[PDB]
C-alpha cells in the first residue's frame, strides 16, 4: 500500500519532486528518513523529518533539498533543486514500519 513516484533523468541544474504515498495506516510516515545509494557506494543519509515536523538535512544537500509531509503524515515529498551528477542514485523513503522499493534519480551533466 505504498506508491513511489517523482524520479527520472534531469540535466545538471534541474529539479525533481520525489513522492512516497502510503494508505492503510495511521500516519505511516510520522517519522521519515530519506536515504540514497549509488552503485559501489554505501547507503547514504539525505534528510529526515521528526515527529515534531523538525527537518534535518545532510550537509551535502542543504540549501538545495526540501523535505515535506502532508498533514495526515501519510505521504512524504523530497523537493530536490540544483541537482548535480553527485546526486545520482536510488532514493529510499523510510517510515517506522514502511520502506519504499527505491526511486531512481539520474543527473546527466
Amino acid at each position: 500500500q505504498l506508491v513511489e513516484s517523482g524520479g527520472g533523468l534531469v540535466q545538471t541544474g534541474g529539479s525533481l519532486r520525489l513522492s512516497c504515498a502510503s494508505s492503510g495506516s495511521i500516519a505511516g510516515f510520522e517519522t521519515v528518513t530519506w536515504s540514497r545509494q549509488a552503485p559501489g557506494k554505501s547507503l547514504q543519509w539525505v534528510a529526515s523529518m521528526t515527529k515534531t515536523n523538525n527537518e534535518i538535512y545532510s550537509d551535502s544537500v542543504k540549501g538545495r533539498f526540501i523535505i515535506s509531509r502532508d498533514n495526515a503524515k501519510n505521504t512524504v515529498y523530497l523537493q530536490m533543486n540544483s541537482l548535480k551528477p553527485e546526486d545520482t542514485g536510488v532514493y529510499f523513503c523510510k517510515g517506522p514500519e514502511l520502506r519504499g522499493q527505491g526511486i531512481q534519480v539520474t543527473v546527466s551533466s
Partner: protein, 541 residues
Amino acid sequence: SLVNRKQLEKMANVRFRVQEDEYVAILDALEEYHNMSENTVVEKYLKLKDINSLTDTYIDTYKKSGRNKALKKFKEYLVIEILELKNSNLTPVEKNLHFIWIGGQINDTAINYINQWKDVNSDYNVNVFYDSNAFLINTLKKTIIESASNDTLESFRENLNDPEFNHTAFFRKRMQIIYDKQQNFINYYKAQKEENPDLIIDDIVKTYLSNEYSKDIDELNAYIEESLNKVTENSGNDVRNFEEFKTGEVFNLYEQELVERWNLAGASDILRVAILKNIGGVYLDVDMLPGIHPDLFKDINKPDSVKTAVDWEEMQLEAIMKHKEYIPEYTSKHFDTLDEEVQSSFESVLASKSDKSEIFLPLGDIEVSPLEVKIAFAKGSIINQALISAKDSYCSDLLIKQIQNRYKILNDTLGPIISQGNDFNTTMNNFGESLGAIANEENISFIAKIGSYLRVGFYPEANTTITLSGPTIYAGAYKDLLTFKEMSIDTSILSSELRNFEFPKVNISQATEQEKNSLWQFNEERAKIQFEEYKKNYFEG
C-alpha cells in the same frame, strides 16, 4: 573529544543486527560533524543538535533495540562536546562596559563607582543606558507609596498602638491601597496613549502628579533637565535611540516593568539582555566595583576574627577607600573593628602603591565563547549583577526567549483577571486559582513563584523578579543550551555545569557598600524599621 563514526559503530554494535536507515542517519551526521573544520561555533552546535534529534528518532523507532543503551550514552557524550566547544573556542569580548540607570536622576554614588572602572580601563568604551522619556518613574512610585502609607495610617489610627497590629498588618493593608492607586495610574496611562500616541511617559506622569498630588510642573521640568544633563555628561546612552531594542519583541515587556510595575530592576533585567545581544561586552550593576589587584593584599592574611571571604573582601575595599578616598563617604564601619596591628598593615601597603591600576585590576583582554553569557556567582548561586557576552551570542537569544515565554505565561494568566476590575484581594485570590489550574509537572517551579508579582517593590521580600527576568532565566538558558532545547521552564541543572559559565572572580569586587542597599526590594528586618518610622512620623514624634 566526541567519538567519531567508527567509535560510535563499535559502541552501538549489535551482532547480526542490520544497520537501520535511522542508524545510518546518526552515523552519517556524526561523520559530517567531524568534517566541519571551516564552520562557526554555532554551526557546530546546531550540528550536535541535529545528531541529538536523529538519535532521539532512532530510540523512539526501535524501543527495544540493543543499540539504545549505547545511544543513550552517546547522547550524554553530545553534552560533553557542547562544553568542550564552549570551553575551547573563545573570541575576544567587545571592550564595552555597560551600566543602566533608568527611572530617575542618577545619584552621585553611582557615578563614583562607575568612575573607578573608567580609571583603570582606559581602553574600554563606557555606556550608562538611561531612558529620556521616563525620568519621573521614581518620583511617581515614591509619591504613591507615601500617599498610601498616610491613608493606611489614617485608616488604622486606633489600632496603631494595639500590641497585635504588625508591620505585616501595615504592609498588607497598604498593599491594597497601592494596587488601587497603581491601577488608577495605569488606566490613566493607557487612556492617554490612545487619545494621543505622541505623548511620552514623562508627559503623562507630570500631568498625573499635578492633577492628583498637586506636584509643581516647573520643579518636575527642572528635575528632568538636571537628570538628562547629569547622565549625558557621564557616558549617557539613550534607550530611546536604541533601535534594535525599541523595535524588538521585548520592548513591550520592558515598558510593562518601567511604566506599569515601576520595577526599574526588572526593566533593567530586560534591557541588559538586549544590550549584550545587540552590542556585546561587559554588563555591570552600578553597585559593582573593580576586582582588587591580586598582589595588593596577598601578604596580609585574614584574621580568624573574620570568617567569610565576603567580609574579608568587604574589609579590603574599605581599606582602599579609607586611605585613598577615591569615593567620598564610603563606609569604614567594618574596617574599624580590625585590630590596630592589622589596620597598620593595610595603610602601609596602600601608602606604597600610588597608581590606581596597581590597586584595582584592569579587565584587559577577556575572551568568551560565542555560545554563552558569563554570569557572576554569590552564595554559591548565580546572580546577574555582572555579565559577559559577545554580540549575538547564542545564550543571548535563549535569554530573550526565556523572557518572552515567562511573560507570556504571566500576562495571559494575570491580564484577564486584572481586567475584571476587582480589588487586590479578589484579584489575588482569582490569580491563585488560575495558577492552580494551569499548573503541571513542567511549569510548577515557575507557577509556584509568580503569585506575588503585584507586590513587587511594595511588600517585604516580594521577590518575583528573580523568576521573571533575573538569575532564573540564566539557569533556564544554560539548561536550554545543554539539552538542545528552548524556553525551558524547569531549570534544574548541576552546580558543576553552572560553574562552566562563571564570570571571572578576579575581575570584580561584589562586596561593596552599595550592594547591601537593594533598591527594588526590602526584607522583614527593614520592613520592621520602616513601619516604626512610619508610625512615629504619623504621630509626629
